[PDB]
């Protein structure tokens, strides 16, 4: 109940932000809620065709420490299919509990997990094409503001080597990144946003000129290299109307600047980019890429939360598989295994042995270890990805 | 800088929820500050091959409101393609003043108007597909929490006749709406489980009993009809893995009914629906539908705001079209026809006048009319898509 | 001329089962058929993209024994293409006489051939998909009665393990193949349906219970495990409607098992089943199929009969090739060379020498051998078969 | 138990033509079998994206005729769809009894009906596009002789005007239809072959030349013009290889005669034709056609038999409508409504009443009426192929 | 024999332009060369999937004139079926006399024909898009010079307004059109460009200034406005590379100019057009198109010349039609029907009369009337691309 149409921490703390059912349906138990000890897990129904990039997690130990549950789950930044080596529906997280105790956060478990770990694991395809490229999340402004710091967080552990967001970087520990707008040239001028913009260029960081607003890309580069001298990168965002064959304009751009000694100043792209046309302009020349949409407003996993027990005994509805469940995974070739949670550990064909993957982060509402902070996380899934090509 | 990873209002208002390159750009502006003033229009770069129904303008208002700022916008609710008669790019939000006064909410606007208009538009073509028959949004688990009610909203705008988070629902001024989940089902058995449910069934309020946890929905149908009879509707989630032919199945079930004097008993459908699912559940006798994802995760439009004037002088990028403008639409067939601000009515082949659509919603940072509640401007809203089939 | 819309034995003998135009041009011929002498080769015109199967000669020579005709052929059970290692079309079966003597069987010859084979060939597909997991042919429903037995007959030596008809399981000497139907289950419930079923569950066969009639497959797999010991099979027909996504069930049930300690119980799968469809329930954890339709009523090869040789001199129409030959196979690679008939052997580049492969069936009317039983033949397919995958 | 692979009238009657599941359970329901009277229906699971031309119940009732049963069916020759206007499984024949008395006729009912109707389904596409010229069923060769005369019964009552088996022909009592083979010219030459078969060329039976054997369809065509008067048509088979463009040479041939004043010839065409081809052969000029494979290797129709009742309970599995029921077509608009079968009659918007379309064929095991020879079936199919185009 | 390797026209005159089978086999014919009287017909083998606007026949009576040769043809500027109302191939010149006469021609005719009739029809399609706005052939530059007016010809006579050919422009009677070049801006630069080219515009001649060389379409076009006021057409030709979105830029600079009050400046577009994109740019707002490649390398009819009678009786090969034949066109819906040459009107079913088509150009190698100019039979294409939308 605020100014803008959002949900305070306060909200969803109180179980505001959920479907009434929950309220609606634990009332309705009455008396019985003490006597209604589950096991729930968390497993993705959605695209199975892609392994995900965990993300969001974090924020669900923010949520439910403090209630009398035990909580376990994958380590954000952890990358795997939802089904295992198998085709069996792999937990991402388990919470232990009197159902009436958190039923209500549902919704909000769900919601922290199932589009932060899209975004994540949009950034981690991103990141495969750029390289050892740098990329920067840029697309905030697609989506609400409200969120715009987790996006960020999601898109930085999921290999964005930055951050455009103030709030978003915050999070991350981390200085905003950012280059000169349109609107500067549009107001002054590219000769005086130029200057500018390097005269206003501070720190160890890099210079970087917008050269689409007005002229030619080609020109724009031409005009830059003769004119002034210490310029690490040209930008382009060309207008989707102008942008005929981007690929073959890089180079003419690499060309006209190598032509004239200065071949030192690279070329920087942005605007309605994702793993393929990323690939695409780096092969073509681009060293640096600003990322926006596709990310930021990559489409969420389908994740369900389901009762997967009921006063220690297996118990589920149709489509879901009882029992409460571990994750192992081979320690070398990062094989998958779900098994009953009677089985820590297993034998692995392909380098020794299989070790639980699911660890546990609440014990009776309590954390049980200090949480990463992201680049701690990012650095993890970094070694993740490393196993996907 | 709050709990969990989101910006709260204070956040958003003081410019923290934006790009930085925007407060260092006008920094790096400085004492030209005060000799910039410009005019920004927002477009859609977005999908072009679609209407849009607009929507997250409030927001803006709650935004801009207090800068000294003139905003010109389309009412939301307007349903309208992003291309006019002659493919020209149609504004939706125009603001005047000092560039640096309000340029740093450019991320903000955009944010606020972008994944809303997404969430109404698809709800809108979800009401196309479900006719007389009533659907609601039940999304927000999908997606994360904070803007769970922003959600709820657009969607309720776009035409949904119920939602059901709680905090969403109280923002649109309605109930939440609401059945009894698996979970209750899998904690007690079908049995107890509707019998709880159609006792806590109150007030001027349908029952209707989930019937996919552990029995075919066939059976559990007919076993229903003969163990109950006050029962409104039953629904059907059937997992996916069941689902071989809802159509069929829904068919069979409404037979099987009927055959036994119980065809006054509705069935309602819920998870992975859209207008094609609605449409064809709803012809083969599904009478509710409970539409998720599809809608909560809607990709959002493509709206780029852009100066299209300095200091009363025509000035744009590449790619955009200078000068102020105007949306004249016909009172009619609802031609729409983008025309240079000073013009403001025009003479329309079909049905008489074309009138100017865009609105001045604030004078100097005051509002210039009192704002619609949601359930006005979706009754706004379905007038309008009363034009688009 | 008996009950049913079918030709008896006696009827295709005396060659009431042929298109008239053969006794009206026999007869038209008159004194001539004595001199005439001539040699047809039976061809594939049929589909040439896959190899064949071939089945039902035993048929052709029950027919043209007694006649002074002599009849070359390859042997049932072998697996070739219909075009040689050059493209040219390989000869089936060759009979030479006076064309009076036995032109009227040209349509019972082809018949006799085209769907045995097509069907043999079908089953050996669906052969390989099953690998060392046992299936079984159940189709003759589909199919016209009067048939039943060469249909088994052929799905058998194709690769079939065993057979549901009562008469083709006569014919190739096994016992017929059969589980309860879901008519037991209608008629009686499926508690008394499983337990008459495992207590009629005579000699060295293994019990199966038919899960999928009024339960979901899921539940009826958990009650059945802790019901009943000593069952060996649990079958899963599942209806089309109810099969959203039958390898997924599959799992789930199979672990539904595990987890109660009852992996013991094997699971078969059985409706609307191919070579595609074996292959994924297989991997999915299915052990034994039920297939019928897909073999049963597989499309006919288009054999040609055509006369290639007129009182000694090469004679053909335009499309055939003249002449008497012979079809040489590589003893090894099985590489295939149709040549003339004065050619026997040849040298085949890889292992050794080229073999003739048409055999010698009948002498002047007089089988040249015994004929092999369904048994034996099918030995023969397989190792064939060996060579395809 | 005969020479061939097939079976007698008289082991189909005694429910040897069967699987063996039948007999098995109908022997262990045991003395409970006396008390056990359900009603069977039959209906199309097979293709739905076509309409059917119901064929093959007179062999259904040559078998259950003596039985203690009822039996409802569809007469043959009704064609309709497999779902009524409202998506409900259609009962083609409805069967009650004591299961055990027919319950192992299961197996040869519904191959009966399902090969049957393919076939005169095929027929009738292949009569639409035949239009007011004659085809005729010949492909009894590339299937199973036995049941050779079922084939061209099926075929004729599907539309073909005329058939080539001699059993068959018999069976619809007219006389086999049939010319010259390639075979006559590769014995005698186009010379000697033509002439026999103008010769022997009786009664009001049209004379036709085949003349594809040795030289080109054009010349063939000319050299017959001029050397043979008396000439009602010139039929075209061929080759594969030779057709580069059927259309084409047909038009060829029917100009050269033409010129040469013989335009009275009529040309015929034949072999691997369907509906679309005989459709655009027939536009090229073909006044004729021969019809094989295409229909007598038809796909059969997926017909599943189902208790759909016991004593007088409404009872049925997942996928299918418990109880008896009708069939209701409009005497006008021929729209079809599936209902309980205490319904006789209703009103159809369109045209007045419904009236029931599942007639009574036997009671108690009695015929109830004379059944239609071929010829009246097929001229009720035509009647009733009016109204699909 | 002369510089380049092109055929004087005394060279094809001689024969030398043609294949030597043709003097090698009338040479071998020799002495019966008098004894061989033919008549050959030219038919469209060449796709028959479209109609074509014959063209280049001209040339064809320049070569046969002269010769004892009675030459029909239909006159160029016809545009119809390549196949009459009945699939039957249309003759479009026939040729009289001995084969040893101008059988050495066959191989100069066609070529004179194929890729003439090829790039006239491609025009008119070109034509029927540019609608009542003005297009220009441009297209020389990407074929062989020696043909470039035969080139320009055709064009025009298909539609063409234009031609920028001098040769060819001379040849249709025509100024050459033409607009300054990019070189001459890369030379002088746009600026001094623009002002050389607005000078040097003479006579009634719209002025038209390429604006894509240097900076982008839509600055140059208002710098342009706001320089220069007498000027008529804008051209852009932008660069692949660059035509992101061509339409959308046409409308941006469109939009650009009118709110400058320089509506009244025309835009034309060039470079990579067809009849699909002179379509779509026009409906943006172009209003004059400069088409190359498309026309001027148009794929060339595939024109057969064969003998159709020998000697006065009708003698051909096969795929062809014997006998000499006429064209009639009905004079009202324009159905076309080959008749054989004894046949010269009929009665069309539409509008009275078919009249012969085929007219005779040459008797005994003597012109029967004075050949049109090009703008005449253009007059003719016109009216007769009327009846083709």
Redesign the interface.
């Given at each position: 109940?605020?100014?803008?149409?959002?949900?305070?921490?306060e909200?969803?703390?109180k179980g505001?932000?959920?479907?009434?059912?929950?309220?609606?349906?634990i009332?309705?138990?009455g008396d019985?809620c003490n006597d209604?000890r589950?096991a729930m897990e968390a497993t993705v129904?959605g695209p199975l065709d892609t392994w995900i990039n965990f993300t969001g997690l974090?924020?669900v130990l923010?949520?439910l420490e403090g209630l009398d549950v035990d909580l376990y789950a994958i380590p954000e930044g952890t990358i795997l299919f939802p089904r295992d080596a198998?085709?069996?529906p792999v937990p991402f997280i388990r919470v232990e509990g009197r159902?009436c105790d958190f039923?209500m956060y549902?919704?909000?478990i769900?919601?922290?997990i199932?589009?932060?770990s899209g975004i994540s694991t949009k950034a981690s395809k991103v990141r495969l094409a750029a390289g050892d490229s740098p990329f920067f999340s840029?697309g905030?402004?697609?989506?609400?503001?409200?969120?715009?710091?987790?996006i960020d967080?999601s898109a930085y552990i999921g290999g964005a080597d930055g951050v455009?967001?103030?709030?978003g970087?915050?999070?991350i520990d981390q200085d905003?990144?950012?280059?000169?707008?349109?609107?500067?040239?549009?107001?002054?001028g590219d000769e005086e946003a130029w200057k500018?913009?390097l005269?206003?260029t501070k720190n160890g960081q890099k210079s970087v000129l917008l050269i689409?607003?007005?002229?030619?890309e080609k020109?724009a580069a031409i005009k830059i290299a003769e004119m002034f001298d210490k310029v690490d990168y040209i930008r382009l965002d060309?207008?989707?109307?102008?942008?005929?064959?981007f690929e073959?304009?890089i180079r003419?751009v690499r060309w006209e600047l190598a032509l004239r000694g200065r071949s030192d100043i690279k070329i920087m792209v942005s605007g309605g980019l994702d793993e393929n046309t990323v690939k695409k302009l780096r092969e073509a020349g681009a060293e640096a890429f600003g990322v926006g949409?596709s990310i930021s407003?990559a489409?969420?996993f389908?994740?369900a939360m389901?009762?997967v027990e009921?006063n220690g005994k297996?118990?589920?509805?149709?489509?879901?598989?009882?029992?409460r469940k571990n994750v192992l995974r081979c320690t070398s070739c990062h094989r998958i295994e779900v098994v009953?949670a009677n089985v820590q550990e297993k034998t692995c064909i392909c380098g020794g042995s299989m070790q639980n993957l699911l660890v546990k982060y609440l014990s009776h509402g309590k954390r049980t270890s200090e949480y990463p902070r992201p680049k701690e996380i990012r650095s993890r899934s970094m070694k993740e990805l490393e196993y996907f090509k």
């Open positions: 109940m605020n100014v803008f149409n959002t949900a305070s921490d909200d969803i703390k505001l932000a959920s479907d009434v059912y929950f309220e609606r349906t009332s309705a138990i019985k209604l589950v129904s974090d924020e923010k949520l198998n085709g069996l159902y039923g549902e919704t909000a769900l919601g922290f199932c589009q932060a840029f905030i402004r697609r989506m609400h503001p409200a969120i715009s710091p987790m967080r455009s967001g103030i709030l970087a915050k999070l905003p990144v950012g280059t000169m707008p349109h609107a500067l040239s549009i107001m002054l500018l913009t005269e206003n689409d607003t007005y002229m030619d020109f060309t207008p989707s109307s102008r942008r005929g064959n073959a304009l003419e949409t407003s489409k969420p389908d994740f389901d009762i009921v297996p118990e589920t509805k149709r489509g879901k598989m009882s029992g009953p």
